[PDB]
Symmetry: C5
């Protein structure tokens, strides 16, 4: 008769049972050609170690029962038929820890030689072993283990759909300008066998991904070096004035809550510390020895009516280190008492002058070393950033 191609659609699917594996010879395995286009990196959760991606996915297999001849069917080559009306392999991921809601595709492509072509996009929220060691400059290596969850090698076998170098190089459409940058998707086929004489069909896909170290530059180093340049200005404040600790203590307090707020950036991975704590606790310790310097010089110079400067450390500091850094009436018994009391204040003032004198030279010399130390530390930072 002549109503449509609809005749063919009935005749093939009249008694077609979608439950039995489609082979005329049951020993011949059904080979499923797989193809991956990685569409987008949604989010990495370093805390739970689970990566969520979106994949444009494809399936190709051979159904020997629905084959027909192009002739006497009005030369039709391929036909679209509902997915839930035909046998479908159960390819999923072993790393599955959840189910992303992805649009359900109702149709598949069948040609006259019995090949079924199945396209569907899937959202996989899968667990991945992450190494966050070099936090700003990290490459990450996540496994995507494709398997039929039950079928054997004599039933279902996995092959590539095309040449494995192009899928590696495939950067066709992937959304850039995000947190992650795709380098390559490396395919690898393997026979896994958890049980003796029971091996199941596996095709590993190593997608290796690099973070873009821009958000974590500004959010980490910029206030940090800011806190450095404010303190260097602060060293110029004289210690005797009394504001010397009041500068630094509020600054150390400011650095304390600063490191506590940024503590919720680095993840709660129980593998240990990130390496950037080393690049930060050095800076933390740097302020301590600055603080240790600060109270020391305020401990030296003060008016406490105490000891005179010992000559041994006067020549070493006020002389040697200065050159190194630069390059009858009874009225008489009462008048005698007043100047005697007077010169005692003048002498303690003489004490006040010399201890103050050494301290400023000491303050300047200890100031010189710290600025040179940070600049040398800074030149190490930028040479590491360049390499």
């Amino acid at each position: 008769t002549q109503p449509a191609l609809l005749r063919l659609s009935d005749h093939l699917l009249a008694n077609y049972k979608k439950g039995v594996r489609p082979v005329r010879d049951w020993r011949k395995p059904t080979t499923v050609s797989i193809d991956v286009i990685m569409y987008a990196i949604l989010n990495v959760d370093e805390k739970n170690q689970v990566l969520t991606t979106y994949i444009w996915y494809r399936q190709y297999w051979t159904d020997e029962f629905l084959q027909w001849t192009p002739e006497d069917f009005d030369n039709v080559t391929k036909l679209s038929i509902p997915t839930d009306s035909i046998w479908v392999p159960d390819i999923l991921i072993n790393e599955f820890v959840d189910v992303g809601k992805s649009p359900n595709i109702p149709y598949v492509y069948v040609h006259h030689r019995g090949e079924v072509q199945n396209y569907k996009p899937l959202q996989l929220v899968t667990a991945c072993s992450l190494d966050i060691y070099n936090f700003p400059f990290d490459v990450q290596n996540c496994s995507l283990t494709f398997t039929s969850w039950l079928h054997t090698i004599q039933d279902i076998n996995i092959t590539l759909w095309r040449s494995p170098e192009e899928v590696r190089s495939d950067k066709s459409i992937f959304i850039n300008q995000g947190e992650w940058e795709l380098l390559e998707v490396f395919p690898q086929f393997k026979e896994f066998s958890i049980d003796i004489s029971n091996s199941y069909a596996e095709m590993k896909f190593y997608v290796i991904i690099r973070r873009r170290p821009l958000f974590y530059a500004v959010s980490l180093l910029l206030p940090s070096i800011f806190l450095m340049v404010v303190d260097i200005v602060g060293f110029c404040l004289p210690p005797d004035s009394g504001e010397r600790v009041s500068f630094k203590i509020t600054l150390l307090l400011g650095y304390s809550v600063f490191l506590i707020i940024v503590s919720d950036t680095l993840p709660a991975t129980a593998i240990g510390t990130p390496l950037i704590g080393v690049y930060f606790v050095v800076c933390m310790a740097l302020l301590v020895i600055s603080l240790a310097e600060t109270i020391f010089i305020v401990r030296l110079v003060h008016k406490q009516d105490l000891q005179r400067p010992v000559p041994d450390w006067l020549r070493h500091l006020v002389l040697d280190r200065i050159a190194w850094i630069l390059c009858v009436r009874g009225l008489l018994q009462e008048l005698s008492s007043i100047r005697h009391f007077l010169e005692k204040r003048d002498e303690m003032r003489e004490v006040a002058r010399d201890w103050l004198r050494v301290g400023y030279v000491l303050d300047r010399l200890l100031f010189r070393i710290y600025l040179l130390a940070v600049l040398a530390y800074s030149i190490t930072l930028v040479t590491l950033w360049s390499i």
Copy 2:
């Protein structure tokens, strides 16, 4: 017989198979007319670069098998029939990264000439390439790539349902008073072809959206200019009194945690910085040079029993810059000693008077430049806000 229009409903759908593509000639493609009304901008996630919207969506195609004649069927023109009882095209979005739960519409409209009219609202949570460069004044350009996910150009072809200028101008019902303001929805048809002799039907929709710069005005500039007007009052505090750093340091501390709290407003986009950090770190650096000024003048004036003002910088500052800013008994050997000690304090007081004198003129002159600088900086801010 005469029970109802129900007769027609059976007779058409008696043997109607919803699986085969509805054409009497299989080579003639089924043309699907699409129509978009963008209903609402739900939320932009700049972090993951994914935009979620709600669309009032429509479908129009031709089913040649369910056509009938208005006569002998009691002059019925159109009939409502269940969606899951007829063939439905698989139009979805390539940018799909998730599935929004949207009400499932059970019925579609069929007229006697076989045209199927399908209305359904859909929630699309789709990834979009965002450019957040000019953060308060940004236009955003997001793609909505409509496609049949598998069908060819010889099966499914995409056309507009009406004239493409009205859908552009369509601001009919869209919810304003939100974070985003709709400018236009620009449609564009294209033939995409990832494979040779395999092209698939595509209709791009560029919806271009503008943020409303009101929430980010108050939340950014108002405390910022507030922190400016409190410091200008603070410059009037005398440096010798000792409170001079205590004002500014707490203020700089206050500005430090202020910028850390607002750091979680700007997103974690790894494309680099927003431009508003330039409009902010300038203000940040402005306080530094204020702080640098502050400790400098406190370094100048202090009572440390040291050097007298050099005349070369006395004429340049206390004289030139002042005019520029304004426009036999042995009792004698003891009495000789007391005034000698006395005038030493008076002389260091003479030292205390002159160094204090220059500093206040210096404080006032350096004060004049900063207020003029901020006001000039402010007049640049408002002229940019007007343009």
Copy 3:
């Protein structure tokens, strides 16, 4: 026969097709009586402008095909039959932006005259145009636009199920003690027509809801007035002592982070500011002029070895404003020098006495105005709270 009422259940539903619209005459529209009981206000999201509620909902229509006679069926009046076995109208909401999961009711009520009674509770997460202008005292007006999403006025028409005043007054069961208090649910019927000779059936429901201004009283004004009463105690601290700025600056700092924390209470609506920022930035500015007062009086009184009080402003302040606020040997040449030096300190002390004298009267007079200002400002606050 006599097995049960089950006979009737078969006989009616034997050939009953749930797909065709149930009318013997196709031109007669099926009228759907709607009824609303608003059960609870779950949450308002001012950010995205979307209101989520729970409704106890009802449907009433006429199915002319399943009518029967009470006689010869053992006098049965009504019968419960599965929802998915009969035709159901598609009434939904145009404001739908999402789908709340609500229990699916499997059965409906059918009486012998063919009326189908459908009860089901639904969770609607719908977008609503909000006006948060008067933030503590706001009434909100949200639309619930009920429509058949496709059917015409000749097929489906919407009526009330009972008198529209009772549903307005309906406060039967609604959960109080929550964030929102139900005033009324105002129904309104309208014919909307987006297209010429194509109008679709609409029944608007304006539910108008009021917030309960109790959580936002304590969370806003109580620490705010607290910060006021601590500063009034602080004005009594003498400015010369040096602690004068140290009080207020920490207090201004405390007020700075206070306003930053409460900044995440008011929503990110891009319609502009809430009005309560006016009721807050006034208080913010109030501390500034207090701070401006504070440094001013500390700028007046200090020991800087400078100018004497000018008489013109001495009579205006120390005299006029005080009454307004209250209501041969050569030993002689050396002894001459010591008192000469001595009286210079005594004279600068004389300078220290008078400048201090004016300042305290000045401090007290400027103190009087501010307390009267806040109390007058406070009496404005409570008279607004009463109205």
Copy 4:
């Protein structure tokens, strides 16, 4: 024949329609015996007033159509059959505001006398009227209103499955060591009737639950009493030294952000305040009067070159309150001037001695009252904690 019990399974369910209510006489109501085991309190949301629990639930009713005789069926007593193959009552909760995903149980128990036994666990996220008045020691009373959502008293009637005292006392398995402790689950049956001659079957279950006041003890009182014991140490700091406000102001600042952080513990219920704000703002006000004391004593003692202590308040304080708390040459005209100037400083020093003297006695006496006040306040706290 003899294949299995499968014969019975067919014979009963051959023509069994799951849509019609299972009664041979339609007037006899189907009585559904209900049983509740409350398994766990998941979370209380005081903000939205909605309680989420997990219930082990049971259903018992009578199906007169599937009854059979144990004989000639190989003495089978009960049989397991799929839930979706038989009629199931629609018992749900009126307080339903959402749907928790709970495992779907596929089978039910049928015995030969036609009784259907239905077990299924359900997750109910239901709205509950909460009273958070006594925040640490609260009992909460939540309603669980079980109803058939449509069926009448002549169709479905609700009874207990066993004696109502055991379900009350039922603490069998419930998970302790959580935020909530189960006291009892009180059942109550009632006929509700919203409409005249239309009453629907209701069985109320009052589960009354108590919080465990341990997390909120440490998180509230421990830092609070800590802030008390640090201030009592702070009162010993002398006011003249200048650090007196600097202690307390930072402490008051610390208490200010402390109360702001703990402000997000108490919920946003619009019923008013919790009672614990009274137990906290008293402590808040306690520091104010301490602060008021602090600036007062610093206002008393200072060196401002002003008034002498009035005798009336010298006897009342330095005398009475002290005992209460404890239990020819012209050289002469110049020499005359110097001591005259000298004794003026000594006299103002005499002023400095006496005003300082009264203040410390005043500081100690005002110190005594505050420590006794807090200890008395503390003894009130612990006697309330014991009762």
Copy 5:
């Protein structure tokens, strides 16, 4: 005939009803062999006491109806058939408080002897009784109670699938480098019976899990010991200088907000406190007695024109404790007055010298004990960390 193995697939499943329990003799119970591979620990929620895991799960039972002979069926051994076409036991978990979305496996394995092999991975979000007593070093013991939710011991009985020691030792694939480390999964079978002559089939699985104490080391002790090493440097600051409280108070403030931020790490479990608060409030109290020391020494030394050092405590401190820590004209009547006034200042200066003298020795001696105390406290900390 010879089309395929498809013949067998029909012949077995032609009249196979998936609703009746598959036994030829109804008294013989169907034994379900269970097997567990625990795949990953997703997240522990100590707040609600609910553990979420992912399990690779297996089912094994015997279907006596679908048995066949390998001969005359082309020697086929096993066959894959759809899950929803055969009877499936209802094994779930009693601890279920929610439903995780896990991929639905469509097929199961049937061999010719009638054994059905069911593989499926499941996500179980289940409530677990947690003991967080030793917070960094905790072992946790969670129950996984596997049961058929309704079937009796005469219908369904639970056995292991293999030897119970290997499943215990099974560390095959589990994802390490996470928050939790798998020690063992201990299986145990038990007959539970809530009702007399009604016992239901139970197999308990105790998985015992250990946290990895690395994230909570750095996040707790590192800033804490940091706050210790900054204070020890702070003790060297002299108390007379006035900065003595200003150091510690800001530090105590810094420690106050530090403990408030880390307060949201420990959970809100109402079982009481964690033990680590003891290891922290000791450190908290340590700063108090440091603060108590700080104000004490500032209370001792000050210039208040008061009492002389009593000899009894001078020998005990300045002598004994110092050695323990180290190892005619009328001009005369006026001149008489000036030195008399002069020596009064010198004498109060003599008072200023001695009280200052004792305090520094006192400051140093009290300094020695605290450093030894923390180091002894520290050596207790590290010996506990080693054990």
